[PDB]
Amino acid sequence: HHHMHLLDTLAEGLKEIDARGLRRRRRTADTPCAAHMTVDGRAIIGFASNDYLGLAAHPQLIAAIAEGAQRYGAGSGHSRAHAQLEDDLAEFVGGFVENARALYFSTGYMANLATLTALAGRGTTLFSDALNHASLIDGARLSRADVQIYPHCDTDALSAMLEASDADVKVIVSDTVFSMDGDIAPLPRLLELAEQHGAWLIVDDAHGFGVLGPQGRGAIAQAALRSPNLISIGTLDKAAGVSGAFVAAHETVIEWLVQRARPYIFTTASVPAAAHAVSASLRIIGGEEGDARRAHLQQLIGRTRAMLKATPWLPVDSHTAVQPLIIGANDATLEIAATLDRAGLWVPAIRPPTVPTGTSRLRISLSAAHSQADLDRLEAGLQQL
């Protein structure tokens, strides 16, 4: 009956997590991801997912999964569906550069990792927005480059850091929509600085793809940017409602990634049915149904912004589906989330280190699948709190 003494340190750390209010609960969904979902046998309205267009449970995407598996098999063992998706993505999101290509990756993390390891090295300096999500942080540390953090969206500070750098290779890295705040990065000014200093501008559009710009092509498209310095990363498990991720860039950039990125990064792939279903999702996102879903989401955002302002708490000023409400402490945030959970509304409580100390917050995530009746109930829940 041997005992591993390090189990004791884990057990003590878990108890400390309970006391400090940082315990995480994983809930099991009895029904598909959607506006209304059943959890533990009780139907609730969910504001927790990043299913921004309501596509995760869409009948056309369910059908595309089934069709994709019948055509290409259950597992990948580069399927024809993966190759076709790369063509479809280049056409949809590559408008910022002539002769765009795209690469499909299993996860957003892998997409970031492939891009940074291929382009960054010793002698590269990487300039990173302070609120960038942790995957981008992790990808950069692996790159073996010097990482300099510029203050959030502070392009004057970044301009001063760029000129105070003699590096042979400079890379600027920013999320487009910040996942816990909802604000949109100053891409026009960031790109100006990138061209002036001869730097790559790598932008992660995880939370802007599908919901920003003409036909939902994303944040670069919204900013109407055109430059070969741009490298566009996105994920396909949020607005697109399936799984996977992409890098889109000038074909020379893509070919360099194929030749220089760590080969194991290409050895993982989602099931072929997933790639086939993303191609179907692009047709919805870019079509009249996508336009209608986005227009409805914009109306939900407009109502929710004022709803949050009416509460005693401080909203983060967001024009995207991410609608945070700052409470303050962990305990006070968990208490309010539980009051909403009792009213049948699932609103996550975000806590450090995900967010700065003293800014624990509800993260209300809107979806085009939500109705005005759903916001009626969220409002009543907030008004009662």
**Ranges of each domain in the chain:** 28-59+287-385, 60-286
Phi, psi of 322 (to 5 degrees): -85, 115
Q: What is the dihedral of CA 276, 277, 279, 281, to 10 degrees?
A: 180
Instruction: Write down the experimental method used for this entry.
Output: X-ray
**Which residue numbers belong to the known binding site?**
24, 108-109, 133, 179, 207, 235, 354
Sheet holding 345-346, edge to edge: 36-39, 42-46, 345-346
- Judge whether 193 and 127 are in contact, CB under 8 Å: no
Resolution in angstrom units: 1.8
Helical H runs in the chain? Answer: 6-19, 59-72, 80-93, 108-119, 134-142, 155-163, 187-196, 219-222, 251-260, 272-285, 288-309, 330-342, 372-384
Burial call 115-134: b when 16+ CB within 10 Å, e when fewer: bbbbbbeeebbbbbbebbbe
In the CATH scheme, what is the code of domain 28-59+287-385? 3.90.1150.10
Radius of gyration over alpha carbons of the chain, in Å?
A: 21
Active site residues: 179, 207, 238
The candidate with the shortest Cα–Cα distance to 358, out of 322, 383, 335, 331, is: 331
**Which residue numbers belong to the known binding site for pyridoxal 5'-phosphate?**
108-109, 179, 207, 235
SS3 66: helix
- Judge whether 244 and 237 are in contact, CB under 8 Å: yes
Rounded-to-integer distance, Cα 347 and Cα 360, Å: 13
- How many whole angstroms from its chain centre is CA 259? 27
**Which residue numbers belong to the known binding site for substrate?**
24, 133, 354
In the CATH scheme, what is the code of domain 60-286? 3.40.640.10
Rounded-to-integer distance, Cα 300 and Cα 210, Å: 16
Burial category of 192 from C-beta neighbours within 10 Å (exposed 0-12, middle 13-18, buried 19 and up): middle
Rounded-to-integer distance, Cα 30 and Cα 44, Å: 11
Rounded-to-integer distance, Cα 382 and Cα 347, Å: 11
Helix (H) or strand (E) run with residue 231 in it: strand 230-235
CA-CA distances (angstroms) from residue 261 to 103, 112, 134, 146, 244?
A: 12, 11, 20, 19, 18
Rounded-to-integer distance, Cα 306 and Cα 329, Å: 23
